[PDB]
Amino acid sequence: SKGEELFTGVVPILVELDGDVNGHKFSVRGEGEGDATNGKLTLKFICTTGKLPVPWPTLVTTLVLCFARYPDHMKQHDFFKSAMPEGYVQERTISFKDDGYYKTRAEVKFEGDTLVNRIELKGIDFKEDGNILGHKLEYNMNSHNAYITADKQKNGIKSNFKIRHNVEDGSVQLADHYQQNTPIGDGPVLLPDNHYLSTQNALSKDPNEKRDHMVLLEFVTAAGITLGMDEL
């Protein structure tokens, strides 16, 4: 598979999200670029419908793992780029402890020269003055490692991991992610050995932006697969 060859330079990114959480509807559009050689993403997200009714951090994981940096001696475990350009479907349920849950379905694929992430999100059973609908989460994102396993019986990968959102009162809101990815096209895809992605995020604001928005810098790097015997 020559999908990896599509990520050797800097690749423009488009993210479009339609959301509906407890009947609060919203849209987000993001634009930026990805640099898979460094595992680097830089995007600016706009809530195009006005006010985002959930905290920006709760959408970070939903708003392009094909840009993770896989070390050379792990390239054969990079499912995400192998599925390109025909792309993959990314599906999650994100269960917020003692609160509601998101269900997401995304298509990540190339459209022209641009990597596009198109997401449908439905949120259900949230408390209107909980941490999510009540906007009680701090504007940041803790670094986290997410374990990846192959899903042979689906030709894809799966992953479950916990995100820990800092609450404004010092407590922590748990967001349990269950994720599954499957290719869109029928080409050959890499089924990795078990490994993890290591992720860091920096969230900020654009001074000259009055719209509700999030400026995001993200690094994703693959790890967890051992070495030792490499002399070609």
From TrEMBL:
Q: Superkingdom of this entry's organism?
A: Eukaryota
Q: Which InterPro entries match?
A: GFP, GFP-related, Green_fluorescent_prot
State if Nucleus is listed as a keyword.
Answer: no
Q: What keywords is this UniProt entry annotated with? A: Chromophore, Luminescence, Photoprotein
Q: Which residues form the signal peptide?
A: none
Please, one GO biological process term? generation of precursor metabolites and energy
Q: Tell me the Gene3D superfamilies matching this sequence.
A: Green fluorescent protein (2.40.155.10)
Oxidoreductase as UniProt keyword = no
Q: Which family does it belong to?
A: Belongs to the GFP family.
- Recorded protein name is Green fluorescent protein
The gene behind this protein is gfp
